[PDB]
Amino acid sequence: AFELSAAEREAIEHEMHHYEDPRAASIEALKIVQKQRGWVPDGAIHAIADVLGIPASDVEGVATFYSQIFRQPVGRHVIRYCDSVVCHINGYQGIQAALEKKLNIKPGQTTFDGRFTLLPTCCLGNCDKGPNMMIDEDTHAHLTPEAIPELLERYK
Amino acid sequence: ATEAGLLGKNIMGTGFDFELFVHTGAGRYICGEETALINSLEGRRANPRSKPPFPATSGAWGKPTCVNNVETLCNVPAILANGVEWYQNISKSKDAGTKLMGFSGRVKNPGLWELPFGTTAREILEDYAGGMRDGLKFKAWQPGGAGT
Amino acid sequence: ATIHVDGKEYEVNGADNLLEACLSLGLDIPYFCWHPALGSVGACRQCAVKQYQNAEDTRGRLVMSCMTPASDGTFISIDDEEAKQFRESVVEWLMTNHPHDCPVCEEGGNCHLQDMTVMTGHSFRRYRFTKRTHRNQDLGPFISHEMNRCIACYRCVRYYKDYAGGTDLGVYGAHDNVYFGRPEDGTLESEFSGNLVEICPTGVFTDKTHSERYNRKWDMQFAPSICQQCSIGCNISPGERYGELRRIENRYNGTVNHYFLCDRGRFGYGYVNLKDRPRQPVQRRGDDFITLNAEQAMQGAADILRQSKKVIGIGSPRASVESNFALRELVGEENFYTGIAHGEQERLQLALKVLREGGIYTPALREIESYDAVLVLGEDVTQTGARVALAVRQAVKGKAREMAAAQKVADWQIAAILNIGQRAKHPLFVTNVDDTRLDDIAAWTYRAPVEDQARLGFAIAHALDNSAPAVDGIEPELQSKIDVIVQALAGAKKPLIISGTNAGSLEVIQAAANVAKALKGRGADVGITMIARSVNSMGLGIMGGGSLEEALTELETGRADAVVVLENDLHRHASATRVNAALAKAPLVMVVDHQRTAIMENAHLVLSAASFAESDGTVINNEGRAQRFFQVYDPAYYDSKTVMLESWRWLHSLHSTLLSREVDWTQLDHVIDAVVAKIPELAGIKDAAPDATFRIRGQKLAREPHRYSGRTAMRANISVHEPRQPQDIDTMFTFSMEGNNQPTAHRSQVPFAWAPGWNSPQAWNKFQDEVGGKLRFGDPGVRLFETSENGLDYFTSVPARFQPQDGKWRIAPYYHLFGSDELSQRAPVFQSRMPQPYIKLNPADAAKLGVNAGTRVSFSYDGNTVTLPVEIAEGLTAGQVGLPMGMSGIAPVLAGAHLEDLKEA
Ligand code: SF4
Ligand code: SF4
Ligand code: SF4
Ligand code: FES
Numbered sequence A: 001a002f003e004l005s006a007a008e009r010e011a012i013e014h015e016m017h018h019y020e021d022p023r024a025a026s027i028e029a030l031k032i033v034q035k036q037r038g039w040v041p042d043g044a045i046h047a048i049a050d051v052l053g054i055p056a057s058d059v060e061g062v063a064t065f066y067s068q069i070f071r072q073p074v075g076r077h078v079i080r081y082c083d084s085v086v087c088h089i090n091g092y093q094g095i096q097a098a099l100e101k102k103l104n105i106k107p108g109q110t111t112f113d114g115r116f117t118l119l120p121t122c123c124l125g126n127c128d129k130g131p132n133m134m135i136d137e138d139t140h141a142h143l144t145p146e147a148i149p150e151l152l153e154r155y156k
Numbered sequence B: 001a002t003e004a005g006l007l008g009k010n011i012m013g014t015g016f017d018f019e020l021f022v023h024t025g026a027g028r029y030i031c032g033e034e035t036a037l038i039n040s041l042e043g044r045r046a047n048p049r050s051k052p053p054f055p056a057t058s059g060a061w062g063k064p065t066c067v068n069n070v071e072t073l074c075n076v077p078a079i080l081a082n083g084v085e086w087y088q089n090i091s092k093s094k095d096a097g098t099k100l101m102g103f104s105g106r107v108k109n110p111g112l113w114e115l116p117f118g119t120t121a122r123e124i125l126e127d128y129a130g131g132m133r134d135g136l137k138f139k140a141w142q143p144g145g146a147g148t
Numbered sequence C: 001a002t003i004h005v006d007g008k009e010y011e012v013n014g015a016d017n018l019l020e021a022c023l024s025l026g027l028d029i030p031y032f033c034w035h036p037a038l039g040s041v042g043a044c045r046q047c048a049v050k051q052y053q054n055a056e057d058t059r060g061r062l063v064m065s066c067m068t069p070a071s072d073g074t075f076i077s078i079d080d081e082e083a084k085q086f087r088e089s090v091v092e093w094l095m096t097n098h099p100h101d102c103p104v105c106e107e108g109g110n111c112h113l114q115d116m117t118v119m120t121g122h123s124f125r126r127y128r129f130t131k132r133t134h135r136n137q138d139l140g141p142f143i144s145h146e147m148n149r150c151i152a153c154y155r156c157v158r159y160y161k162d163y164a165g166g167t168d169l170g171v172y173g174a175h176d177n178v179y180f181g182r183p184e185d186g187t188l189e190s191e192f193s194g195n196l197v198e199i200c201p202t203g204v205f206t207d208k209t210h211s212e213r214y215n216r217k218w219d220m221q222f223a224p225s226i227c228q229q230c231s232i233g234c235n236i237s238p239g240e241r242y243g244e245l246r247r248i249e250n251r252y253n254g255t256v257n258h259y260f261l262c263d264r265g266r267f268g269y270g271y272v273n274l275k276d277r278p279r280q281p282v283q284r285r286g287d288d289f290i291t292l293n294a295e296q297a298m299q300g301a302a303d304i305l306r307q308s309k310k311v312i313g314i315g316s317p318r319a320s321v322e323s324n325f326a327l328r329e330l331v332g333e334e335n336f337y338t339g340i341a342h343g344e345q346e347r348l349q350l351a352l353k354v355l356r357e358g359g360i361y362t363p364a365l366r367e368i369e370s371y372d373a374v375l376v377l378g379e380d381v382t383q384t385g386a387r388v389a390l391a392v393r394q395a396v397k398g399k400a401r402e403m404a405a406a407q408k409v410a411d412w413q414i415a416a417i418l419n420i421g422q423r424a425k426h427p428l429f430v431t432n433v434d435d436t437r438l439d440d441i442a443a444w445t446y447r448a449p450v451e452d453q454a455r456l457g458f459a460i461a462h463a464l465d466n467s468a469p470a471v472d473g474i475e476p477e478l479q480s481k482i483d484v485i486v487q488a489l490a491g492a493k494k495p496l497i498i499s500g501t502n503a504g505s506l507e508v509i510q511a512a513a514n515v516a517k518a519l520k521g522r523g524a525d526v527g528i529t530m531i532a533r534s535v536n537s538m539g540l541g542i543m544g545g546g547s548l549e550e551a552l553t554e555l556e557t558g559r560a561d562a563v564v565v566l567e568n569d570l571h572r573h574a575s576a577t578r579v580n581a582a583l584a585k586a587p588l589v590m591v592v593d594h595q596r597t598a599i600m601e602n603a604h605l606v607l608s609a610a611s612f613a614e615s616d617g618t619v620i621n622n623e624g625r626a627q628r629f630f631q632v633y634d635p636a637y638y639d640s641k642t643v644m645l646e647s648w649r650w651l652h653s654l655h656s657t658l659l660s661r662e663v664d665w666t667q668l669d670h671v672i673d674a675v676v677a678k679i680p681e682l683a684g685i686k687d688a689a690p691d692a693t694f695r696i697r698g699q700k701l702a703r704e705p706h707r708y709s710g711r712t713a714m715r716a717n718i719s720v721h722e723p724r725q726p727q728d729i730d731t732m733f734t735f736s737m738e739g740n741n742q743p744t745a746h747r748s749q750v751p752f753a754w755a756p757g758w759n760s761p762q763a764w765n766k767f768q769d770e771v772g773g774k775l776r777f778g779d780p781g782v783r784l785f786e787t788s789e790n791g792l793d794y795f796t797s798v799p800a801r802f803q804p805q806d807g808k809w810r811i812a813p814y815y816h817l818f819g820s821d822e823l824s825q826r827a828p829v830f831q832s833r834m835p836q837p838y839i840k841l842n843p844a845d846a847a848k849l850g851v852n853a854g855t856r857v858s859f860s861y862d863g864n865t866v867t868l869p870v871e872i873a874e875g876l877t878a879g880q881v882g883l884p885m886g887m888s889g890i891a892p893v894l895a896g897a898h899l900e901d902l903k904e905a
């Protein structure tokens, strides 16, 4: 039981205006659906395939290829902590341990109330200010393990 | 730039039409490869392509396509404004121009500085990055990121 | 071009890459992701060889032979130490996550991955960590899915999307979690999905129909045969075990059906293994059903045939050439009737006259992939001649191929070809009563009744050449579409026109012939292709005879007191009530058939004939190529009471007992020579295959591999004394492994492909002069007729515009690849694939009748008030009812007929 809303439909059509191939708007269509609903459900693949004209297999392959197109349900806020080499030097392990102590979950799962979903991510391009962490649209730098509990309370 | 006569139709009275778009990615490292970038721009999975053919002859949607870094396109207006001979006379090195260099990782002042080519890595570490932090010794370094 | 492999000089073709050039020369390079039909992508990285640019070079560079052109002056090494270690490492990396599944794998012994693991010489495992696993999907009744065995070689998706045009198979996942399949569970609805079991080098996609009764490849007894499920005549390799037809493998014919079959011809073979088939001659005495052997059946049948005043014979397009000829020579020239109806025979003879008298060359199926602009008139090709639709897809992608070839891009660089030719493709114009499966690549689709399709064809012929008869009354929008078609066809270099007898109209074939004549008159390399209905429709048309209605009225008026029906159910070409009354009125009905048809209740004598898996014969396909199919197994080897013989043998021995009161079992070459002696138009069937005296250096051709097992134990439950192997006096093959199956043997009939080190279907590489090209020493089967020096004249009988008459409903045929064949629908595996019987209706006509989608309405045809549920068809024109041809109770002869009393009940 899935159906694209109006605003998603004109957003996808306006992004199809940008390219000479309707296939080229698939990533942005998936991102629009993900922005509206938090993630991309099963019927969204076929609905985007219908609105673009491409087969649903290609839409599923694009949705499962990219890590930031979530094909499983996530929480209200997506915590994304960098685990790359410079933040490993700067000690991302303490930040991850503090997040595990606070949220009481493993990386990849969602809390029972659906508030936070914890995810490792690649380099955020802020290695001079490491360690970094990307909450939904906000990047946080110069992290310390004691700043995690004071920093997780601004996302209700 | 579009409202102030710099992008769109008939730019600066010449008669040249150019439209600029921003395509926000979906978070995959392999998308930075130029042929995988072209594949991702076409709405496909970002598998790279074999070369030849190069993207200059058949790139995005089978058309001639040139893929360039941000810093190259940021170097080009200085070349077109201050001249070419000025650009060749920035440093006495075989690599013309200035590169954004810098040290990161447990140093005193990690950052990013514009330096000419030929500056040694020690000058970046002590004069700009300040050297290692308090009570820390130097063991190794990587010049160009994670893939070096 | 000249290359140097390991210091040896070789002359290769410079337009090929190094992998196919070296595989053509007999050099073994391991490979996974490359296929001769699909192209080169450089994925598996298995084909590494060390390249040198000079004759004096020590270091070299490891390159991919599939991605490296075979230019002049390249010095490559295959068995260099670095290249061998890299190929062994690639095999080892593929072996890190591969499951310990070879005993419980259907691809074991037929596995390309096994062959390439053995060829690289990797047999020691140093990987000690875990192996990744995958869940499996349900892909329908035909294809079994086992995702753990995948090596991520991308052959399946490349074939299924870039070749077959399918839309529900793809790559999903990530770094090393790549998944290959469907986004959900469901049946693969591509009509060519069955080729995945041979495209996939591993056991991911397997034949579920073969997996039900599974045996290994060495245990299979193979034969070269021709698929009998439609008129295209694809070469197949049926393989049996323990007296039952186990699998249908693809048999390479570089002229017809090179690497790919269709799903009907690959999974529709289950009628052979039915237990209701007749296995003895059965004679009816009142209510008793007594069983005779061959001699008493011949003596009794000849006695009643001599005690009758006239004997007539009703053949079938399902029978071979020899069996129909034996019936004709048993009953006489004037007493022989073709089993098809009058309209079907008229369409068939018109198509044959166009093919062998129209002066336009009819292409082979491989040659269809080279034509520029394709116009399909009336034919639903993907449901009747599906392999022609696959070749049409290839011809459509020919535009992207030529556009990439204009930019100095190699032929085998398939990814670059698809990149340059993004969506530009060759023009395709299909006409049908509804939407087709070629509409995703068709430049235009015309949904109209067959009269309007014929009128559009005549308008195209008139606009191409003004000497063609004109049709008046065409709308200006239709005129614009017609002139678009005319500008596309006139600008083409090799136009192709495809029609057939399945459209149910004569004027469609006339319009296609006129379009082809107009294209030929402008000086164009036009080809024409007629799609017949059954496997040997063209042979029955060439041999000819009366229609089924003439035989029915001969039986009804009483002039014929003896009717011999050869492999015909007679309800497919005529109404069941009239046929039942005619056969009940006749005092002797003698039916030679291998499937339990409905007319056997009225049959006074039933002769248990042999199917294609148990008989030898010749079949003429839709392009006029005579092809010989050979017997796979002897039915009486296991089951000793089985008396099942070739139909031509039945009828020849019956005629001998009729004439000289002696039973004479003939030979296949004798019947072949009789056909060449009596019918000069069937003279080419002698050269279709060599006779039974043909030997390869004195020995015969083996039907089974040299490692065929269980010889002293497969019959030990019946008796511990192993009998002699059955003797094949008809053909040059033997029912044993004591024979020849070399890749370098001077023959054209290959039962199966096996080479030392090549157990997969990749073993066909050794049996070709060049890989992906022709078969070595020529392809089997010859053409019956050549292109005539002069052509026909313009057909001036332009039909009128279809006006929907009130009360009467025109029957629009809806053919299905699973369901519209007579014998394929009897397979038990097709029951889960055949669509439910739905009558298709316009929204306007259903709104007028008050019917919505789902409910049942009843219609009466020839006193049969049958009720079908309604499916709403938007593309169907008003005034027509869409009916599925070939289903239960709906004959293909119903196409184009009327339908009275269509009411909701
Ligand atoms: S796919 Fe081949 S190698 Fe893999 S388990 Fe099956 S037979 Fe063995
Ligand atoms: S499923 Fe088979 S054909 Fe497809 S990538 Fe895997 S091994 Fe290759
Ligand atoms: S296209 Fe016809 S002859 Fe070929 S495999 Fe299919 S049913 Fe058989
Ligand atoms: S390494 Fe973490 S932000 Fe770059």
Ligand code: FES
Binding pocket: C030, C031, C032, C033, C034, C041, C042, C043, C044, C045, C046, C047, C064, C065, C066, C067
């Ligand atoms: S066959 Fe060349 S890389 Fe696969």
Ligand SMILES: [Ca+2]
Binding pocket: C615, C616, C631, C728, C729, C730
């Ligand atoms: Ca025989």
